[PDB]
From a paper:
Transthyretin (TTR)3 is a 55-kDa protein that aggregates into amyloid fibrils under pathological conditions. In its native tetrameric conformation, TTR transports retinol-binding protein and thyroxine (T4) in the blood and cerebrospinal fluid. Amyloid aggregation of TTR occurs by dissociation of tetrameric TTR into monomers; these partially unfold into amyloidogenic intermediates and self-associate into soluble oligomers and amyloid aggregates. Here we identify two segments of TTR that drive protein aggregation by self-association and formation of steric zipper spines of amyloid fibrils.
Familial amyloidotic polyneuropathy is caused by a number of TTR mutations, including L55P and V30M, which we examine here. Familial point mutations are known to destabilize the tetramer, leading to faster dissociation and consequent amyloid aggregation. The combination was also effective at blocking aggregation of the familial mutants V30M and L55P at physiological TTR concentration. Also our computations with ZipperDB show that TTR familial mutations do not increase the propensity of fibril formation (data not shown). These results support the hypothesis that familial point mutations destabilize the quaternary structure rather than creating new amyloidogenic segments.
Residue numbers in the entry:
A (entry chain A), B (entry chain B), C (entry chain B), D (entry chain A): 10 to 124
Write the structure that this text describes.
Amino acid sequence: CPLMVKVLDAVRGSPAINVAVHVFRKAADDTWEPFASGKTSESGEPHGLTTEEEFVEGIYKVEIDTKSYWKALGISPFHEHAEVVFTANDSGPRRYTIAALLSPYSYSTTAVVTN
Amino acid sequence: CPLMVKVLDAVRGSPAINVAVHVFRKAADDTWEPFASGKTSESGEPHGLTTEEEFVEGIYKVEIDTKSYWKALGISPFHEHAEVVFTANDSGPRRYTIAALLSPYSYSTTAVVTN
Amino acid sequence: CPLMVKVLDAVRGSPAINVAVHVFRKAADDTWEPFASGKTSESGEPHGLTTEEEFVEGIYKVEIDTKSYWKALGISPFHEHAEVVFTANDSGPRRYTIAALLSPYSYSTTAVVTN
Amino acid sequence: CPLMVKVLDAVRGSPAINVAVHVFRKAADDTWEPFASGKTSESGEPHGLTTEEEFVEGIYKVEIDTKSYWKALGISPFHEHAEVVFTANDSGPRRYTIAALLSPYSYSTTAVVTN
């Protein structure tokens, strides 16, 4: 798994479960093409997003459906979603983990890029 | 000022100065229309983004050009930008402060909403 | 005001009001001596914590009473408090803003240091 | 492992390696007693901090040596350390993960408490 997403809930102190995660890759015509998607498991991760063959260099967007998550918990959210946009560059062997920490009026994201 | 943006640098421990901030509003055809833009001052804020008359109900996107900021400091950044997407004024006019905290491989954002 | 504290609530999207803030300074015997304390106003800040004369070089601790804040809102919190520990004025007098963002199971803090 | 600590670096986009982690438990006399310690591995975690038998209810403090970490990377840090203080209550079967995200002038922490 060269691309992993981990979503945590800062209100309940737990992984954010049943969250929709959509991944897009910037096409040559500058539009966002669907790339991969899933729903977070009990661990807060959508399993098997992509492969080493499909995940080439490019600009990617990871859209997390935070609005549906907070609505399902009966909590009033601020954001429509959380979108993380980054260039993936292969320098040496690399795996990307995009971690997101959610609060109703805030989110934090970080990337963990390992050899 | 019904819409304020405050940008901080978590590496240098200071306001993030000379950062481009672009605001868009979702059109009826689902596209992102330009709404307002500016550059952060010494306080990390772009002054005078919009007015109470222009800032109507709708879906807004605040895009912070974090990539050009880190490149100007000679630091290799991960993200293309930091984008915050939210519905504004659905229950009547509100004042919105969007705060962003930047690191080369991470960012946090929060909203402070007042009547 | 050489030492400022700003506290925000990531659940409600507002300043965290009526929060107790306690400041200590490390004594020569390595114990924590009381230095200053206050209560956050409607803006999420305790006004007038210290002066340029009193705020000398040293190691300071800013303890934010997040537990009483969440209990007063009927929300079960994880942390006993949020504590920020730092050396101040080692290279000469500076102005320090300690910003804290609160969630029931998480907090973020950042420092903005200016000459 | 009922108590886990995970430390990430927001500047390098990686786990924070070789970071000292010290855990204390509040004694009946209100002092902080040493409980467990270790140094983070390649994954940003100190392995085998405690056991289900030793990790009883109480008030715990997790101190992360962020200052030595940033100094070892040649980066000027703000904080002396990052301290996370919380009550551990057993309601049902529970595991605690304390996650910390580090920047030179900022840190974020969250707790993940699972059944």
